Design an enzyme around this catalytic site. Structure first.
Site, PDB file in Angstrom:
ATOM      1  N   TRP A  96       0.873  -1.150   0.000  1.00 23.22           N
ATOM      2  CA  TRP A  96       0.000   0.000   0.000  1.00 23.22           C
ATOM      3  C   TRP A  96       0.909   1.197   0.000  1.00 23.22           C
ATOM      4  O   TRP A  96       2.087   1.099   0.385  1.00 23.22           O
ATOM      5  CB  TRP A  96      -0.946   0.064   1.206  1.00 23.22           C
ATOM      6  CG  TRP A  96      -0.299   0.217   2.558  1.00 23.22           C
ATOM      7  CD1 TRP A  96      -0.054   1.399   3.201  1.00 23.22           C
ATOM      8  CD2 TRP A  96       0.174  -0.822   3.448  1.00 23.22           C
ATOM      9  NE1 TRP A  96       0.532   1.178   4.414  1.00 23.22           N
ATOM     10  CE2 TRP A  96       0.687  -0.169   4.599  1.00 23.22           C
ATOM     11  CE3 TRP A  96       0.212  -2.232   3.391  1.00 23.22           C
ATOM     12  CZ2 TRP A  96       1.243  -0.854   5.681  1.00 23.22           C
ATOM     13  CZ3 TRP A  96       0.784  -2.928   4.520  1.00 23.22           C
ATOM     14  CH2 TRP A  96       1.292  -2.212   5.630  1.00 23.22           C
TER      15      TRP A  96
ATOM     16  N   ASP B  97       6.520  -4.329   3.000  1.00 22.06           N
ATOM     17  CA  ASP B  97       6.768  -5.133   4.159  1.00 22.06           C
ATOM     18  C   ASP B  97       7.946  -6.029   3.919  1.00 22.06           C
ATOM     19  O   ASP B  97       8.262  -6.344   2.768  1.00 22.06           O
ATOM     20  CB  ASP B  97       5.570  -6.006   4.437  1.00 22.06           C
ATOM     21  CG  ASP B  97       4.426  -5.229   4.938  1.00 22.06           C
ATOM     22  OD1 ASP B  97       4.653  -4.192   5.601  1.00 22.06           O
ATOM     23  OD2 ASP B  97       3.304  -5.655   4.658  1.00 22.06           O
TER      24      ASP B  97
END
Ligand code: PZM
Ligand code: PZM
EC number: 1.4.9.2
Lengths: 110, 358, 122, 358
Positions: A39, A58
């Site tokens: 995101w 991540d």
């Protein structure tokens, strides 16, 4: 300063800062794998007064770092705006989806 | 003299039971469902749910469904996404249903893991990261349909007035309705007109769900509705949750599973906080507001005890609220809710609580 | 004799680490986990093996053999964690030792909670 | 900016310590946290699933873990394993299969060791019958089950021999095992009785010298085993206590509760007052520094509620660990000096270990 949840680049982080986890704002700790997807956040830079796109890749394939947990929601939007949404695991498409920490990579101006 | 025995059932009647989905985010590979007696706060049992479990209770009340992800060696090895069926009374595993390896991994919004009103299909959110809805046939114990029509949409809102229809929210600001056939494949679909401006007034995904219509609240305290009394969904709104005095203090909604509807009264419950601004949409509740959905007016406000998620029991006139760790039980038989008790330490990191159906 | 039946005592009394028969418990009391002093929570499996304690009963003034059977096959209950060590000994006196998982021989060795089963007089 | 992986630990090996976090509250997600003891920096981690154990290879190049998996964690087939990880990259390399009886238990050093020559990993088994397992590191194979060690507990390697170790047995004596080139048992011997199991049980943790080990007892006595010769020679007790210590009922307490500074012969022990039956695992009120040659206490300092320790010979350092926090001490002089505390190093750790440097 980058280990603070109030650091300006961390404005849409929901997770653990990799910089507290043996990595840095832009590198995965050893043995954790970067997510190819993420995101994206739009965060205001207080120094130059401008707003920048930040990619929240991540690091994956290790269990939860547990350090410097941040939950910031500046310009974050629900799952129907999926790549602005941070309540999902952006490790979801990794070879191993276990979530370790989050990086905060400056992409460009917003 | 004494011998330890197992094989036992939950001590308290089903009508007393609630399910607190503890993500255990700090140790997310060991998430679990805590089962509690809401009448007295007694811990009744648990169901382990591995990495980022999701949970629901079968409509008939006999089974607990979980959805989780395993890997052969946890942090490496082959992935298995599954739905599990567990017995509600024995809290024992009965069976595993394979899913393709793309079930949504994320916080426990109700709408990621649901079922058709008739209980015959489990309906779940996929993200690979392309979105689709997955359909699992409960009788067959099989995954039977991937609804790719729902790409670019998010979350599952069952329609309580139809056996096997549901809606999802799409990125055009409209709703897609899916009507399943008896085989669990898509028999028909339709798309509503734009309900909300995605850019200007984004809604929270949590519905305030009635028999034949759903209400949604926006980041800015507006309310939108989707009426599905007919085959085509009719959308409307906004009306504001806020009166002129509320506007001074910038009251806005915040939370996760942040709304609920008491269907018999039309009362909608919403978590609210003041000093609203960009980035406050997940803030804990300073207050719970109770809105009459027909008159479009607040009829009550109580202190929110930092709650983030709620659920409603229609039959007993109860609302549960959850701050992440503690559960509050409210009597909502009257417009002003009355706090009955708090269950402290029900979870470490839970944003979802659910009643056993009765 | 009443102090020999935990089922008759106050829930607050038996759920406490200081309850007399919990004298060598290292783990979560099953009685706080949806079970009782002598029954496993639903869907957890009794351990066939255990460490054993000798615990003084202050109520009747006699000493008793307590068998610390675990309940297994579910993840950590997390409630009423006790660490008591009365007459506990190291692993070279293995069946008196509580720093090992007494679920170790179960079909699933995941440790859930611990019971305190009265074997009899010491 | 672009996100990269493939990095090694950022600090030199000489600064690294390993905190084995059991995460007892969520024991299926145990892990090893790697810290820099010089500045308290978190350097990385290794996941170790259910009740992991860890050691670092003698050569400093690998991390070895021992853990247990099940196909579905709480159900399915069990796999007990050793894993080999690269020490610098903290990446998984190799799994070595174990019979499904590796010890599941608290992280005493003695349950997971290696031979002086580094060629064999030596581990404790319990079925619940105890045996010791030998793993050929090179071959990546389990090679020998030492059932002769039945009724004994823990592995104490002998730093003066390539592939010999001792275990403490239920007769109050020590069994020495001497491995052949292939890891099978070549020879073995049993010592005479060192301590009375019933009257003066010892803590299993050794204060280990190059050819002698000392042990402390529940009542504050000290026992020694000498293995300079062909057969082990046992002595003791001598008391750690003076008259004032006895009147205050000072006794040892903890888990990995002793250490030896070899150059000086100083033994470090965790102690607490008002000792009685059942206090053997109490946190340290004090750390006592004993001269093993003169058998006198040469220092006593606050224990900071510590439970486990470890010593670095070459840098003259002791680490203590209270369950979550790691304390670093300079032990170059008889009185230790506290250099720093690393707060929140673990949630539930009873073992810390230095990266090997010599
Ligand atoms: C899977 O549940 C999760 C996991 C990770 C995160 C972090 N963006 C959010 C939700
Ligand atoms: C697997 O490690 C464990 C597990 C459970 C216990 C409790 N007796 C001790 C050690």
């Amino acid at each position: 300063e980058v280990n603070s949840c109030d650091y300006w680049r961390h404005c849409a982080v929901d997770g653990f800062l990799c910089s507290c986890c043996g990595g840095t704002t832009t590198t995965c700790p050893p043995g954790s794998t970067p997510s190819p997807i993420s995101w994206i956040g739009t965060c205001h830079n207080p120094h130059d007064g401008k707003d920048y796109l930040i990619s929240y890749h991540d690091c994956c394939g290790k269990t939860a770092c547990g350090r410097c947990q941040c939950n910031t929601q500046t310009r974050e939007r629900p799952g129907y705006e999926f790549f602005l949404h941070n309540d999902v695991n952006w490790c979801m498409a990794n070879e191993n989806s276990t979530f370790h920490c989050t990086t905060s990579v400056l992409v460009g101006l917003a | 003299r004494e011998v330890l025995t197992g094989g036992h059932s939950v001590s308290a009647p089903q009508e007393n039971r609630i399910y607190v989905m503890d993500s255990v985010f700090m140790h997310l590979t060991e998430s679990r469902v805590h089962v509690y007696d809401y009448t007295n706060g007694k811990f009744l049992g648990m169901v382990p749910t591995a990495f980022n479990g999701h949970v629901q209770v079968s409509n008939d009340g006999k089974k607990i469904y979980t959805m989780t992800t395993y890997h052969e060696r946890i942090t490496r090895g082959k992935r298995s996404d599954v739905v599990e069926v567990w017995d509600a009374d024995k809290l024992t595993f009965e069976k595993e249903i394979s899913l393709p390896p793309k079930r949504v991994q994320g916080l426990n919004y109700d709408g990621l893991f649901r079922q058709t009103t008739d209980g015959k299909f489990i309906v779940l959110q996929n993200a690979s990261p392309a979105t689709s809805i997955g359909i699992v046939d409960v009788a067959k114990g099989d995954y039977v349909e991937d609804v790719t029509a729902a790409a670019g949409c998010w979350s599952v809102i069952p329609q309580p007035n139809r056996p096997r229809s549901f809606m999802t929210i799409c990125g055009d600001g409209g709703l897609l309705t899916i009507n399943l056939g008896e085989d669990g494949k898509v028999a028909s679909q339709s798309r509503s007109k734009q309900m909300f401006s995605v850019k200007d007034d984004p809604i929270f995904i949590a519905p305030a769900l009635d028999k034949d219509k759903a209400h949604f609240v926006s980041y800015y305290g507006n309310v939108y509705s989707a009426d599905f009394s007919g085959d085509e969904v009719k959308v409307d709104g906004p009306w504001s949750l806020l009166n002129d005095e509320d506007k001074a203090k910038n009251w806005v909604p915040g939370g996760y599973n942040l709304v609920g509807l008491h269907r018999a009264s039309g009362r909608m419950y919403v978590f609210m906080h003041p000093d609203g601004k960009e980035g406050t949409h997940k803030f804990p509740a300073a207050e719970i507001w109770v809105m009459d959905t027909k008159t479009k007016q607040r009829v009550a406000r109580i202190p929110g005890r930092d709650a983030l998620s709620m659920t409603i029991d229609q039959q007993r006139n109860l609302m549960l609220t959850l701050d992440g760790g503690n559960v509050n039980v409210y009597d909502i038989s009257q417009p002003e809710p009355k706090l009955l008790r708090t269950i402290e330490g029900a979870a470490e990191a839970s944003l979802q609580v659910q009643f056993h159906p009765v």
